[PDB]
Amino acid sequence: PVDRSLLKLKMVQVVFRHGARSPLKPLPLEEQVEWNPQLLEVPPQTQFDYTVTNLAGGPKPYSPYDSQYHETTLKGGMFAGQLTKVGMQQMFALGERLRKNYVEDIPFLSPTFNPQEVFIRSTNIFRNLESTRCLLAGLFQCQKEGPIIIHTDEADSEVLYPNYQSCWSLRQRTRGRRQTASLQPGISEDLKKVKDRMGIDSSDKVDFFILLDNVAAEQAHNLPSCPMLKRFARMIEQRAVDTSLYILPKEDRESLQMAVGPFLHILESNLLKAMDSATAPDKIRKLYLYAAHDVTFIPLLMTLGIFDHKWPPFAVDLTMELYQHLESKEWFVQLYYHGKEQVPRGCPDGLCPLDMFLNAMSVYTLSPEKYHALCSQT
């Protein structure tokens, strides 16, 4: 048994999903809920100025995703996929929770944003950059000692989600299952049933991802959803998860490696920086922030053996704390998901000795050189 009073907090990594937003695509029904631009009013307490650069960096890369979303105008006038004031407030509250843990309860982080203590990375999509702003606003109460810089990568090299367009081997392994996923036993019958009851045309192309997208977005904003959409909300969520897992199952190790392995390699590398005491204390940070996606969380959670079979909700976070025992000099990792203490695969306890944790992750970790080899057929 370890006495936690001799544990000293060294490093924190937070991976989070953006807050509540408008749907990527609306449902194909004559009667749709309105997405009103009034939902985009910025809460004053989240006002924080930042700039975005590439990883170098370097100018903010072009975002194909932002362009794609602006091609879709929802009933009411909002664009698809935009963070709302509801989402901004969720991200702010996550920020204030972090402040409680890492600023107030122990003096780990400065009360004001210090560029040298914090590394910030996001995918290059407006809802993630804005969520990052709101998280920081809550964590630092809109106070900074220096400019906030968010790093983002070119879409073609991005590792913060499974990248199908850039990784040829991943695309090839999953293509067959992706084709047939909605035709699988029990998924297909449920899908047919929900579409029938909702009066959605048999010809319309709709899967559980689209249904879940809309019910989660509508529910988070308390919009007047179709009564049948509400009746099936839980089943819809379950089947969206089943679809995802059929395509990228826990038993397919190599697909998991290519999907999340490079991101895990990043998280591992951060932990390892603690093993070198003298080397580059300049490069090391106290806090690493990554704005990632629900499609990142699912495989990520599975590789850590903590997946709960729920769709990762708006503003969810995965938090990794690294401690060193002051007497023993042993290193320990603690993992939390959505505020809840977790016990990862291959770990005896919630407080996991660093060496055992690293061994567990190493099953799925993918170095950049290996990953690069697989991204190409030739």
Swiss-Prot record:
Annotated GO CC locations: cytoplasm; mitochondrial matrix; mitochondrion
Tissue expression from the record: Highly expressed in kidney, heart, small intestine, muscle, liver, prostate, testis, ovary and weakly expressed in thymus and colon.
Active site: 18, 294
Example GO BP: phospholipid metabolic process
Mutation effect (residue 216 to F/L): Decreases enzyme activity by interfering with water access to the active site cavity
Subcellular location: Mitochondrion
Secreted as UniProt keyword: no
Family label: Belongs to the histidine acid phosphatase family.
Name of the featured protein: Lysophosphatidic acid phosphatase type 6
Gene: ACP6
